[PDB]
Protein backbone atom coordinates (compact mmCIF):
# COMPACT_ATOMS: atom_id res chain seq x y z
CA UNK A 1 0.00 0.00 0.00
CA UNK A 2 2.69 2.52 1.10
CA UNK A 3 5.84 3.32 -0.89
CA UNK A 4 7.85 5.50 1.51
CA UNK A 5 8.73 4.09 4.93
CA UNK A 6 9.31 5.83 8.24
CA UNK A 7 9.74 4.78 11.84
CA UNK A 8 7.21 7.54 12.66
CA UNK A 9 3.55 6.74 12.34
CA UNK A 10 1.08 9.53 11.47
CA UNK A 11 -0.78 8.61 14.66
CA UNK A 12 2.16 9.83 16.82
CA UNK A 13 1.94 13.32 15.32
CA UNK A 14 -1.86 13.41 15.69
CA UNK A 15 -1.59 12.21 19.34
CA UNK A 16 0.63 15.15 20.22
CA UNK A 17 -1.88 17.55 18.71
CA UNK A 18 -4.70 15.58 20.41
CA UNK A 19 -3.11 15.91 23.86
CA UNK A 20 -3.12 19.68 23.29
CA UNK A 21 -6.80 19.69 22.18
CA UNK A 22 -7.85 17.60 25.17
CA UNK A 23 -5.84 19.70 27.67
CA UNK A 24 -7.25 23.06 26.48
CA UNK A 25 -10.83 22.11 25.54
CA UNK A 26 -10.45 22.64 21.80
CA UNK A 27 -13.60 21.56 19.89
CA UNK A 28 -13.62 21.45 16.04
CA UNK A 29 -13.02 24.84 14.39
CA UNK A 30 -12.66 25.26 10.62
CA UNK A 31 -10.20 24.14 9.12
CA UNK A 32 -8.59 22.12 11.91
CA UNK A 33 -9.54 18.73 10.39
CA UNK A 34 -8.05 19.72 7.05
CA UNK A 35 -4.88 20.82 8.85
CA UNK A 36 -4.57 17.48 10.67
CA UNK A 37 -4.94 15.54 7.40
CA UNK A 38 -2.09 17.71 6.04
CA UNK A 39 0.06 17.02 9.12
CA UNK A 40 -0.46 13.28 8.62
CA UNK A 41 1.04 13.44 5.08
CA UNK A 42 4.39 15.06 6.04
CA UNK A 43 7.75 13.36 6.50
CA UNK A 44 10.24 14.43 9.21
CA UNK A 45 9.06 17.53 11.06
CA UNK A 46 8.83 19.46 14.35
CA UNK A 47 5.33 20.17 15.67
CA UNK A 48 4.93 23.28 17.85
CA UNK A 49 1.82 23.84 20.01
CA UNK A 50 1.14 27.25 21.57
CA UNK A 51 -1.17 29.25 23.81
CA UNK A 52 -1.99 32.93 23.58
CA UNK A 53 -3.10 34.43 26.92
CA UNK A 54 -4.88 37.80 27.27
CA UNK A 55 -5.72 38.43 30.93
CA UNK A 56 -8.01 35.50 31.77
CA UNK A 57 -8.73 34.42 28.17
CA UNK A 58 -6.82 31.54 26.56
CA UNK A 59 -6.58 31.05 22.77
CA UNK A 60 -4.97 27.61 22.40
CA UNK A 61 -5.87 26.53 18.77
CA UNK A 62 -2.34 27.41 17.59
CA UNK A 63 -0.16 24.78 15.89
CA UNK A 64 2.83 25.20 13.59
CA UNK A 65 4.50 22.40 11.58
CA UNK A 66 8.20 22.83 10.65
CA UNK A 67 9.49 20.72 7.73
CA UNK A 68 12.79 19.11 8.71
CA UNK A 69 14.07 18.18 5.25
CA UNK A 70 15.55 20.23 2.41
CA UNK A 71 12.81 19.80 -0.22
CA UNK A 72 11.96 23.47 -0.13
CA UNK A 73 10.03 23.71 -3.39
CA UNK A 74 7.90 20.70 -2.49
CA UNK A 75 7.21 21.93 1.05
CA UNK A 76 6.20 25.43 -0.05
CA UNK A 77 3.90 23.99 -2.72
CA UNK A 78 2.17 21.49 -0.36
CA UNK A 79 1.68 24.30 2.20
CA UNK A 80 0.11 26.56 -0.43
CA UNK A 81 -2.17 23.70 -1.53
CA UNK A 82 -3.40 23.59 2.09
CA UNK A 83 -4.13 27.34 1.96
CA UNK A 84 -6.07 26.92 -1.31
CA UNK A 85 -8.10 23.94 0.00
CA UNK A 86 -9.06 25.95 3.09
CA UNK A 87 -10.12 28.88 0.88
CA UNK A 88 -12.56 26.73 -1.09
CA UNK A 89 -15.26 27.32 1.56
CA UNK A 90 -17.61 29.85 -0.03
CA UNK A 91 -17.69 32.23 2.95
CA UNK A 92 -13.89 32.17 3.41
CA UNK A 93 -11.75 34.62 1.44
CA UNK A 94 -7.97 34.72 1.64
CA UNK A 95 -5.89 37.57 0.30
CA UNK A 96 -2.65 35.94 -0.87
CA UNK A 97 -1.33 39.05 -2.69
CA UNK A 98 1.50 39.73 -0.18
CA UNK A 99 2.80 36.18 -0.51
CA UNK A 100 2.39 36.41 -4.31
CA UNK A 101 4.61 39.53 -4.33
CA UNK A 102 7.26 37.80 -2.20
CA UNK A 103 7.34 34.68 -4.42
CA UNK A 104 7.03 36.47 -7.83
CA UNK A 105 9.52 36.06 -10.69
CA UNK A 106 12.07 33.27 -10.86
CA UNK A 107 12.17 32.66 -7.11
CA UNK A 108 15.45 31.08 -5.99
CA UNK A 109 14.38 28.14 -3.78
CA UNK A 110 18.04 27.29 -3.05
CA UNK A 111 18.11 30.40 -0.82
CA UNK A 112 15.37 29.02 1.46
CA UNK A 113 16.60 27.85 4.85
CA UNK A 114 13.42 26.96 6.82
CA UNK A 115 9.65 26.57 6.15
CA UNK A 116 6.64 26.29 8.50
CA UNK A 117 2.88 26.07 7.97
CA UNK A 118 0.33 26.65 10.77
CA UNK A 119 -3.03 27.82 12.15
CA UNK A 120 -4.46 30.12 14.87
CA UNK A 121 -8.20 29.39 15.07
CA UNK A 122 -10.96 31.22 16.91
CA UNK A 123 -14.67 30.69 17.55
CA UNK A 124 -15.46 33.60 15.20
CA UNK A 125 -14.62 32.48 11.64
CA UNK A 126 -13.29 35.85 10.44
CA UNK A 127 -10.88 36.21 13.36
CA UNK A 128 -9.20 32.86 12.54
CA UNK A 129 -6.01 32.83 10.45
CA UNK A 130 -3.65 30.54 8.53
CA UNK A 131 0.13 30.96 8.61
CA UNK A 132 3.15 30.38 6.37
CA UNK A 133 6.78 31.06 7.38
CA UNK A 134 9.80 31.18 5.09
CA UNK A 135 13.39 31.87 6.22
CA UNK A 136 15.83 33.02 3.54
CA UNK A 137 19.54 33.75 3.58
CA UNK A 138 21.87 35.84 1.41
CA UNK A 139 19.14 36.78 -1.08
CA UNK A 140 19.32 40.55 -1.64
CA UNK A 141 16.38 40.97 -4.07
CA UNK A 142 13.86 39.16 -1.87
CA UNK A 143 15.14 40.56 1.39
CA UNK A 144 14.45 43.97 -0.18
CA UNK A 145 10.92 42.91 -1.14
CA UNK A 146 10.18 41.63 2.40
CA UNK A 147 11.43 44.88 3.93
CA UNK A 148 9.22 46.89 1.57
CA UNK A 149 6.12 44.85 2.36
CA UNK A 150 6.80 45.42 6.08
CA UNK A 151 6.72 49.25 5.71
CA UNK A 152 9.39 50.21 8.19
CA UNK A 153 11.49 53.34 8.18
CA UNK A 154 14.91 53.57 6.47
CA UNK A 155 16.48 53.73 9.95
CA UNK A 156 14.97 50.40 10.98
CA UNK A 157 15.53 48.81 7.56
CA UNK A 158 19.24 49.46 8.07
CA UNK A 159 19.29 47.43 11.33
CA UNK A 160 18.21 44.14 9.70
CA UNK A 161 20.92 41.59 8.94
CA UNK A 162 21.74 40.27 5.51
CA UNK A 163 22.80 36.65 6.19
CA UNK A 164 19.44 35.23 7.38
CA UNK A 165 15.88 36.47 7.93
CA UNK A 166 12.80 34.69 9.26
CA UNK A 167 9.59 35.94 7.60
CA UNK A 168 5.96 35.14 8.56
CA UNK A 169 2.74 35.59 6.54
CA UNK A 170 -0.71 35.73 8.24
CA UNK A 171 -3.99 35.11 6.25
CA UNK A 172 -7.23 35.83 8.13
CA UNK A 173 -10.30 33.97 6.89
CA UNK A 174 -12.15 37.27 6.21
CA UNK A 175 -9.51 38.50 3.74
CA UNK A 176 -7.11 40.51 5.95
CA UNK A 177 -3.39 39.73 5.65
CA UNK A 178 -0.06 40.81 7.07
CA UNK A 179 3.70 40.17 6.89
CA UNK A 180 6.03 40.00 9.93
CA UNK A 181 9.86 40.13 9.96
CA UNK A 182 11.71 38.51 12.91
CA UNK A 183 15.29 39.88 13.08
CA UNK A 184 17.33 37.90 15.61
CA UNK A 185 20.61 37.51 17.48
CA UNK A 186 22.18 34.25 18.69
CA UNK A 187 23.78 33.77 22.11
CA UNK A 188 27.32 34.34 20.78
CA UNK A 189 26.12 37.64 19.27
CA UNK A 190 24.05 39.20 22.01
CA UNK A 191 27.03 38.54 24.34
CA UNK A 192 29.51 40.13 21.90
CA UNK A 193 30.47 43.40 23.62
CA UNK A 194 29.82 45.81 20.73
CA UNK A 195 26.36 44.18 20.46
CA UNK A 196 25.22 44.25 24.07
CA UNK A 197 25.95 47.89 24.92
CA UNK A 198 24.13 48.69 21.68
CA UNK A 199 21.18 46.63 22.91
CA UNK A 200 21.18 48.69 26.09
CA UNK A 201 20.42 51.82 24.00
CA UNK A 202 17.15 50.43 22.53
CA UNK A 203 15.80 48.10 25.27
CA UNK A 204 15.18 48.41 28.99
CA UNK A 205 17.12 46.39 31.59
CA UNK A 206 13.88 44.50 32.28
CA UNK A 207 13.83 43.37 28.64
CA UNK A 208 17.46 42.32 28.83
CA UNK A 209 17.27 40.46 32.14
CA UNK A 210 16.33 37.03 30.65
CA UNK A 211 19.16 36.88 28.07
CA UNK A 212 21.43 34.53 30.12
CA UNK A 213 18.61 31.93 29.88
CA UNK A 214 18.40 32.07 26.07
CA UNK A 215 20.32 30.92 23.04
CA UNK A 216 18.30 33.11 20.62
CA UNK A 217 16.55 36.50 20.93
CA UNK A 218 14.44 38.36 18.41
CA UNK A 219 11.89 41.08 17.75
CA UNK A 220 8.75 40.85 15.66
CA UNK A 221 8.10 43.79 13.32
CA UNK A 222 4.76 43.93 11.51
CA UNK A 223 2.20 46.54 10.38
CA UNK A 224 -0.37 44.42 12.27
CA UNK A 225 1.36 44.70 15.72
CA UNK A 226 0.32 47.40 18.17
CA UNK A 227 3.94 47.36 19.44
CA UNK A 228 7.10 45.38 18.62
CA UNK A 229 7.02 41.84 20.05
CA UNK A 230 10.01 40.49 22.01
CA UNK A 231 10.92 36.80 21.43
CA UNK A 232 13.03 34.71 23.88
CA UNK A 233 14.21 31.17 23.10
CA UNK A 234 14.97 29.57 26.49
CA UNK A 235 17.49 26.75 26.72
CA UNK A 236 15.66 25.10 29.65
CA UNK A 237 11.88 25.05 30.25
CA UNK A 238 12.55 24.53 33.97
CA UNK A 239 14.15 28.06 34.22
CA UNK A 240 11.09 29.85 32.92
CA UNK A 241 9.05 30.63 36.04
CA UNK A 242 12.03 32.12 37.93
CA UNK A 243 12.27 34.95 35.42
CA UNK A 244 8.75 35.37 33.95
CA UNK A 245 6.00 36.10 36.55
CA UNK A 246 3.03 34.92 34.45
CA UNK A 247 -0.62 34.90 35.57
CA UNK A 248 -2.67 31.81 36.50
CA UNK A 249 -4.16 31.40 33.01
CA UNK A 250 -0.69 31.24 31.43
CA UNK A 251 0.51 28.99 34.27
CA UNK A 252 -2.01 26.30 33.29
CA UNK A 253 -0.42 26.04 29.83
CA UNK A 254 3.16 26.04 31.15
CA UNK A 255 2.44 23.54 33.95
CA UNK A 256 1.00 21.10 31.36
CA UNK A 257 4.06 21.30 29.09
CA UNK A 258 6.49 20.94 32.03
CA UNK A 259 5.33 17.30 32.05
CA UNK A 260 4.89 16.50 28.32
CA UNK A 261 7.59 14.63 26.43
CA UNK A 262 9.28 16.73 23.77
CA UNK A 263 11.87 19.45 23.58
CA UNK A 264 13.28 20.97 26.76
CA UNK A 265 13.37 24.36 24.99
CA UNK A 266 10.49 26.85 24.78
CA UNK A 267 9.64 30.24 23.26
CA UNK A 268 7.95 33.09 25.08
CA UNK A 269 6.71 36.21 23.27
CA UNK A 270 5.42 39.48 24.73
CA UNK A 271 5.62 43.27 24.47
CA UNK A 272 8.29 45.30 26.26
CA UNK A 273 5.56 46.90 28.40
CA UNK A 274 4.76 43.42 29.82
CA UNK A 275 8.42 42.86 30.76
CA UNK A 276 8.32 46.05 32.84
CA UNK A 277 5.13 45.05 34.65
CA UNK A 278 4.98 43.33 38.00
CA UNK A 279 2.93 40.47 36.56
CA UNK A 280 2.61 39.22 32.95
CA UNK A 281 -0.98 39.15 31.73
CA UNK A 282 -0.48 39.13 27.92
CA UNK A 283 1.91 36.49 26.61
CA UNK A 284 2.32 33.71 24.04
CA UNK A 285 3.95 30.36 25.08
CA UNK A 286 5.36 27.78 22.57
CA UNK A 287 6.42 24.12 23.10
CA UNK A 288 7.38 21.46 20.62
CA UNK A 289 8.21 17.84 19.85
CA UNK A 290 10.38 16.43 17.05
CA UNK A 291 9.37 13.61 14.68
CA UNK A 292 12.42 12.16 12.96
CA UNK A 293 12.62 8.77 11.24
CA UNK A 294 15.35 6.57 12.71
CA UNK A 295 15.96 4.36 9.66
CA UNK A 296 19.31 5.35 8.06
Amino acid sequence: SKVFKSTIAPEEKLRYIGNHKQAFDIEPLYPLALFEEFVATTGDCIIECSGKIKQDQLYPARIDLQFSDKHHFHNIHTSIDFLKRAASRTDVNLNLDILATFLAGNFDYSKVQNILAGIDLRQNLGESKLKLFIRIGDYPAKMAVAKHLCNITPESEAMLRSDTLHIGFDFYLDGRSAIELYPELKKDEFNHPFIYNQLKTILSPEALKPLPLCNLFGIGLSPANEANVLYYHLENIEDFLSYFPINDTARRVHDFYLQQEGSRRMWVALSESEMKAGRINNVNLYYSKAFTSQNP
Binding site: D64, Q66, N114, Y286, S288
Partner: peptide, 5 residues
Protein backbone atom coordinates in the same frame (compact mmCIF):
# COMPACT_ATOMS: atom_id res chain seq x y z
CA UNK B 1 12.87 23.96 18.83
CA UNK B 2 10.95 25.34 15.83
CA UNK B 3 11.70 28.59 13.93
CA UNK B 4 15.50 28.47 14.44
CA UNK B 5 18.10 28.47 11.67
Amino acid sequence: GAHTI
